[PDB]
Coordinates of C-alpha atoms and ligand atoms in Angstrom, one line a residue:
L1 CA -27.8 -45.0 -24.1
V2 CA -31.1 -44.7 -22.3
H3 CA -32.7 -47.8 -21.1
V4 CA -36.3 -47.3 -19.7
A5 CA -37.8 -49.9 -17.2
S6 CA -40.8 -51.4 -19.0
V7 CA -43.2 -53.3 -16.5
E8 CA -43.8 -57.0 -18.2
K9 CA -47.5 -56.6 -19.4
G10 CA -50.1 -56.6 -16.7
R11 CA -47.9 -58.1 -14.0
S12 CA -47.8 -56.7 -10.3
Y13 CA -46.7 -57.8 -6.8
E14 CA -48.6 -60.8 -6.6
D15 CA -46.7 -62.2 -9.8
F16 CA -43.1 -61.2 -8.7
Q17 CA -43.8 -63.1 -5.4
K18 CA -44.5 -66.4 -7.1
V19 CA -41.3 -66.0 -9.1
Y20 CA -39.6 -65.3 -5.6
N21 CA -41.4 -68.1 -4.3
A22 CA -40.3 -70.8 -6.5
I23 CA -36.8 -69.8 -6.4
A24 CA -36.9 -70.2 -2.4
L25 CA -38.5 -73.4 -2.8
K26 CA -36.1 -74.9 -5.1
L27 CA -33.0 -73.3 -2.7
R28 CA -34.5 -75.1 0.0
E29 CA -34.9 -78.4 -2.1
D30 CA -31.6 -78.5 -4.0
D31 CA -29.8 -78.5 -0.9
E32 CA -27.0 -80.8 -1.8
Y33 CA -24.9 -78.2 -4.2
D34 CA -21.2 -77.6 -3.7
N35 CA -21.0 -80.0 -0.7
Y36 CA -24.2 -78.8 1.2
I37 CA -23.9 -75.0 0.8
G38 CA -26.4 -75.0 -1.5
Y39 CA -27.1 -72.4 -4.4
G40 CA -27.2 -69.4 -2.5
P41 CA -23.9 -68.1 -2.7
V42 CA -23.5 -68.5 -6.8
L43 CA -27.1 -66.9 -7.4
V44 CA -26.0 -63.8 -5.7
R45 CA -22.5 -63.9 -7.3
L46 CA -24.4 -64.1 -10.6
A47 CA -26.7 -61.2 -9.9
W48 CA -23.5 -59.3 -9.0
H49 CA -21.6 -60.2 -12.6
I50 CA -24.3 -59.2 -14.8
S51 CA -24.5 -56.0 -13.2
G52 CA -20.9 -55.5 -12.8
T53 CA -20.3 -54.9 -16.4
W54 CA -21.9 -51.4 -16.1
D55 CA -20.1 -48.5 -17.2
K56 CA -21.4 -45.2 -15.9
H57 CA -19.5 -43.2 -18.7
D58 CA -21.8 -44.3 -21.8
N59 CA -24.3 -46.2 -20.2
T60 CA -23.2 -49.9 -21.7
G61 CA -23.6 -53.0 -19.7
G62 CA -25.6 -53.7 -16.5
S63 CA -28.1 -55.7 -15.2
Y64 CA -31.1 -54.4 -18.0
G65 CA -30.5 -56.0 -21.1
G66 CA -29.9 -59.6 -19.7
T67 CA -27.3 -60.3 -22.1
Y68 CA -25.6 -63.1 -20.1
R69 CA -27.6 -65.6 -22.1
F70 CA -25.7 -64.8 -25.0
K71 CA -22.5 -66.9 -25.7
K72 CA -20.1 -63.7 -25.5
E73 CA -21.0 -63.0 -22.1
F74 CA -21.7 -66.5 -20.9
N75 CA -18.3 -67.6 -21.8
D76 CA -16.3 -64.8 -20.2
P77 CA -13.4 -66.6 -18.0
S78 CA -14.4 -63.9 -15.3
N79 CA -17.8 -65.9 -15.3
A80 CA -16.4 -69.5 -14.9
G81 CA -18.8 -71.6 -12.4
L82 CA -21.8 -69.2 -13.0
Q83 CA -23.4 -71.4 -15.7
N84 CA -24.5 -73.3 -12.4
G85 CA -26.7 -70.8 -11.5
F86 CA -28.0 -70.3 -15.0
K87 CA -29.1 -73.9 -14.8
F88 CA -30.5 -73.7 -11.5
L89 CA -32.8 -70.6 -12.9
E90 CA -33.7 -72.2 -16.2
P91 CA -36.5 -74.3 -15.2
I92 CA -38.3 -71.3 -13.3
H93 CA -38.0 -69.5 -16.5
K94 CA -39.7 -72.2 -18.4
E95 CA -42.1 -72.2 -15.7
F96 CA -42.8 -68.0 -16.0
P97 CA -42.0 -67.4 -19.5
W98 CA -43.1 -63.7 -19.3
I99 CA -40.0 -62.5 -16.9
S100 CA -37.5 -61.1 -18.5
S101 CA -33.8 -62.3 -18.2
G102 CA -32.7 -59.4 -16.4
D103 CA -35.4 -59.5 -13.9
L104 CA -35.1 -63.1 -13.3
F105 CA -31.1 -63.2 -12.6
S106 CA -31.3 -59.9 -10.3
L107 CA -34.6 -61.3 -8.4
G108 CA -32.3 -64.9 -8.1
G109 CA -30.0 -62.5 -6.1
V110 CA -32.7 -60.8 -3.9
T111 CA -34.4 -64.0 -3.0
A112 CA -31.0 -65.8 -2.0
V113 CA -29.9 -63.0 0.3
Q114 CA -33.5 -63.1 2.1
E115 CA -33.7 -66.7 2.3
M116 CA -30.2 -66.9 3.6
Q117 CA -31.4 -64.5 6.5
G118 CA -30.0 -61.3 5.4
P119 CA -31.3 -57.9 5.0
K120 CA -34.8 -57.4 2.8
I121 CA -33.5 -56.0 -0.4
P122 CA -36.3 -53.4 -2.2
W123 CA -36.6 -54.7 -5.9
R124 CA -38.0 -53.1 -9.0
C125 CA -39.3 -54.8 -12.3
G126 CA -39.0 -54.0 -15.7
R127 CA -35.8 -54.7 -17.3
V128 CA -36.3 -55.5 -20.9
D129 CA -34.2 -58.2 -22.9
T130 CA -32.0 -56.4 -25.4
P131 CA -30.3 -57.8 -28.9
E132 CA -27.1 -60.1 -29.1
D133 CA -25.0 -56.9 -30.5
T134 CA -25.7 -55.0 -27.2
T135 CA -23.5 -57.6 -24.9
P136 CA -20.6 -56.1 -23.3
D137 CA -17.2 -57.4 -24.4
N138 CA -15.2 -59.6 -21.6
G139 CA -12.7 -57.7 -19.5
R140 CA -15.1 -55.5 -17.5
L141 CA -15.2 -57.7 -14.3
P142 CA -12.4 -57.1 -11.5
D143 CA -9.2 -59.2 -11.0
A144 CA -8.6 -60.8 -7.8
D145 CA -4.9 -60.2 -7.3
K146 CA -4.6 -56.6 -6.8
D147 CA -4.7 -54.0 -3.9
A148 CA -6.8 -51.1 -2.4
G149 CA -6.1 -48.4 -5.1
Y150 CA -7.0 -51.0 -7.6
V151 CA -10.5 -51.8 -6.0
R152 CA -11.2 -48.0 -5.4
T153 CA -10.5 -47.2 -9.1
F154 CA -12.4 -50.4 -10.4
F155 CA -15.5 -49.2 -8.4
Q156 CA -15.6 -45.6 -9.1
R157 CA -16.8 -46.9 -12.9
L158 CA -19.9 -48.3 -10.9
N159 CA -20.5 -45.1 -9.3
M160 CA -19.6 -46.6 -5.9
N161 CA -18.0 -44.9 -3.1
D162 CA -15.7 -46.1 -0.3
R163 CA -18.8 -47.4 2.1
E164 CA -20.5 -48.8 -0.7
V165 CA -17.6 -51.0 -1.8
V166 CA -16.8 -52.0 1.7
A167 CA -20.7 -53.1 2.4
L168 CA -20.7 -54.9 -0.9
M169 CA -17.7 -56.9 0.0
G170 CA -19.2 -58.5 3.1
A171 CA -21.2 -60.7 0.6
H172 CA -17.7 -62.6 0.6
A173 CA -18.7 -64.4 3.8
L174 CA -20.8 -66.4 1.5
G175 CA -20.1 -69.6 -0.3
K176 CA -16.1 -70.2 -1.2
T177 CA -13.4 -69.9 -4.2
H178 CA -13.0 -73.1 -6.1
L179 CA -9.9 -73.5 -7.7
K180 CA -11.0 -74.9 -11.0
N181 CA -13.2 -71.7 -11.6
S182 CA -10.7 -68.6 -10.9
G183 CA -7.5 -70.3 -9.5
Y184 CA -8.2 -69.9 -5.9
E185 CA -9.4 -72.4 -3.0
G186 CA -11.1 -72.2 0.1
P187 CA -14.1 -70.5 2.4
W188 CA -13.7 -67.0 3.8
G189 CA -15.7 -68.1 7.3
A190 CA -17.5 -71.0 8.7
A191 CA -21.1 -69.8 8.2
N192 CA -21.1 -70.1 4.0
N193 CA -25.0 -70.0 3.5
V194 CA -25.9 -67.9 6.2
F195 CA -25.9 -63.9 5.6
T196 CA -23.8 -62.2 8.4
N197 CA -21.2 -59.5 9.1
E198 CA -18.6 -62.7 9.8
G199 CA -16.3 -61.4 7.0
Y200 CA -15.3 -58.4 8.6
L201 CA -14.7 -60.1 11.8
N202 CA -12.6 -62.9 10.5
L203 CA -10.4 -60.1 8.6
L204 CA -9.8 -58.3 11.8
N205 CA -9.4 -61.5 14.2
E206 CA -7.6 -64.2 12.5
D207 CA -3.9 -64.6 11.9
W208 CA -3.4 -64.4 8.2
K209 CA -0.3 -66.0 6.1
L210 CA 0.4 -65.2 2.8
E211 CA 0.7 -68.6 1.2
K212 CA 1.2 -69.9 -2.6
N213 CA -2.0 -72.1 -3.8
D214 CA -2.1 -75.2 -6.0
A215 CA -2.5 -72.9 -9.1
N216 CA 0.3 -71.0 -8.1
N217 CA -1.5 -67.7 -7.1
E218 CA -1.3 -66.0 -3.7
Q219 CA -3.8 -65.9 -1.0
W220 CA -3.8 -65.3 2.3
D221 CA -4.4 -68.5 4.5
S222 CA -5.4 -68.8 8.3
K223 CA -4.9 -71.7 10.6
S224 CA -8.8 -72.0 11.2
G225 CA -9.0 -73.3 7.3
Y226 CA -10.4 -69.8 6.0
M227 CA -9.0 -67.7 3.1
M228 CA -9.0 -64.0 1.9
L229 CA -8.2 -62.9 -1.6
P230 CA -5.4 -60.2 -2.2
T231 CA -8.4 -57.7 -2.9
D232 CA -10.1 -58.5 0.3
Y233 CA -7.1 -58.3 2.6
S234 CA -6.7 -54.7 0.9
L235 CA -9.4 -53.5 3.1
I236 CA -7.4 -53.9 5.9
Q237 CA -4.6 -52.3 4.3
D238 CA -6.0 -48.8 3.4
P239 CA -7.0 -46.5 6.3
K240 CA -10.2 -45.3 4.8
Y241 CA -11.6 -49.0 4.2
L242 CA -10.4 -50.0 7.4
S243 CA -12.5 -47.7 9.6
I244 CA -15.4 -48.9 7.8
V245 CA -14.5 -52.7 8.3
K246 CA -14.4 -52.0 12.0
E247 CA -17.7 -50.2 12.1
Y248 CA -19.3 -53.2 10.4
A249 CA -17.7 -55.7 13.1
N250 CA -19.0 -53.8 15.4
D251 CA -22.6 -53.3 14.4
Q252 CA -24.6 -55.8 12.3
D253 CA -27.5 -53.9 11.7
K254 CA -25.6 -50.7 9.9
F255 CA -23.9 -53.6 7.8
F256 CA -27.4 -55.0 6.7
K257 CA -28.7 -51.5 6.3
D258 CA -26.0 -50.4 3.9
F259 CA -25.7 -53.5 2.1
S260 CA -29.3 -53.5 1.1
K261 CA -29.1 -49.9 -0.2
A262 CA -25.5 -50.6 -2.1
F263 CA -27.3 -54.0 -3.4
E264 CA -30.1 -52.5 -4.6
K265 CA -28.2 -49.8 -6.3
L266 CA -25.9 -52.1 -8.0
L267 CA -28.7 -53.8 -9.7
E268 CA -30.7 -51.0 -10.6
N269 CA -27.5 -49.0 -12.3
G270 CA -28.2 -47.9 -15.8
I271 CA -32.2 -48.0 -15.4
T272 CA -34.5 -45.1 -15.9
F273 CA -37.7 -45.6 -14.0
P274 CA -40.5 -43.4 -15.4
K275 CA -42.5 -41.7 -12.8
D276 CA -45.7 -43.3 -13.0
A277 CA -43.5 -46.7 -12.5
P278 CA -44.5 -48.9 -9.1
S279 CA -42.7 -48.6 -6.1
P280 CA -39.7 -50.9 -5.3
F281 CA -41.5 -54.6 -3.9
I282 CA -40.2 -55.9 -0.6
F283 CA -41.1 -59.7 -1.0
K284 CA -41.9 -61.8 1.8
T285 CA -39.7 -65.0 3.0
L286 CA -41.0 -68.5 3.0
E287 CA -40.6 -68.4 6.7
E288 CA -42.6 -65.2 7.0
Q289 CA -45.3 -66.7 4.8
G290 CA -45.3 -70.0 6.6
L291 CA -44.4 -72.0 3.6
Ligands
LIG301 C1 -12.5 -56.5 -6.2 C2 -14.1 -57.4 -6.2 C3 -14.5 -58.9 -6.1 C4 -13.6 -59.7 -6.4 C5 -12.2 -59.6 -7.4 C6 -14.3 -60.8 -6.3 C7 -13.9 -62.2 -6.6 C8 -14.4 -63.6 -6.4 C9 -13.8 -64.3 -6.7 C10 -12.4 -64.8 -7.3 C11 -14.6 -65.8 -6.4 C12 -14.2 -66.9 -6.5 C13 -15.3 -67.8 -7.4 C14 -15.2 -69.1 -7.7 O1 -14.0 -69.6 -7.7 O2 -16.2 -69.8 -7.9 C15 -15.7 -64.9 -5.6 C16 -16.8 -65.3 -5.4 C17 -18.1 -64.6 -4.7 N1 -18.3 -63.5 -4.6 FE1 -16.8 -62.1 -5.2 N2 -15.4 -60.6 -6.1 C18 -15.4 -59.2 -5.9 C19 -16.9 -58.7 -5.6 C20 -18.0 -59.4 -5.2 C21 -19.2 -58.6 -4.9 C22 -19.3 -57.0 -5.1 C23 -20.2 -59.5 -4.5 C24 -21.5 -59.3 -4.4 C25 -22.3 -58.2 -3.8 C26 -19.5 -60.9 -4.6 C27 -20.0 -62.0 -4.2 C28 -19.4 -63.3 -4.0 C29 -20.2 -64.6 -3.7 C30 -21.4 -64.7 -3.1 C31 -19.3 -65.7 -4.1 C32 -19.2 -66.9 -3.8 C33 -19.6 -67.9 -5.1 C34 -19.9 -69.3 -4.7 O3 -19.8 -70.0 -3.5 O4 -19.9 -70.0 -5.7 N3 -18.4 -60.7 -4.7 N4 -15.5 -63.7 -5.9

């Protein structure tokens, strides 16, 4: 399969910056969701779930086609809870009907990271909506109850190496797990809508205890009220992953730089960009614009 990026007709930087500002302004306005965590964390989870179906072997899945609008994908049990992020985006799409679904779902993720004071993420336009029979089947997204060997093997399918996987996993400092969505309960840290390396710091410094939650699943719990999934705790069990966790716990800037590259790569996997396509855009935050 070859998916070639095609810029929405006649659009440029200024057009996509208006759609960024529309999302950022509504993120500020709708601050009450999920006991005042707001919508930022479920929007970067949605951008990762629409990209995380990709398979490097035959180029199916990925962000390009925006197939999450179709029932088979929207109803995947792995996507429980992301309907909240899709309904947040629906008024923005009605206001800007020219943007493709893939571009809006990935730009929602870039916007949230930047507005939660994370790194700038360069983003490229041009995903094109494809037909319902191109919707990937359920079951391509990862399980939470596994170990380090599983995480490593799983992410090889998305062409991600150990540094990229540990950097990507730093996004679990955002938001929280919800018992009715995944069968796990609790936050990973104290700062759940500010982008930071606190996940790595908690993993190395908290006293964790393996307990069973109300959905009868095991998870690691700390005396401070934080939790870690089996797949998160993995990162300190494996020797290769633990050296990178220690590097990011001691250098916030290197974590920001490595996340930015790996999150842009995630969102662009499977897409061919023509050599005459525009450069990646870097959008300004509302704060840098004084809005
Ligand atoms: C082996 C890899 C991963 C697994 C098993 C996993 C698992 C989970 C689970 C079980 C939840 C809870 C969902 C809920 O109950 O609402 C969650 C939430 C979340 N995940 Fe992951 N995840 C993985 C990788 C990632 C990556 C690569 C990113 C982002 C780059 C990410 C970002 C998030 C965010 C921000 C949330 C918070 C959602 C919210 O607060 O509503 N995850 N993850």
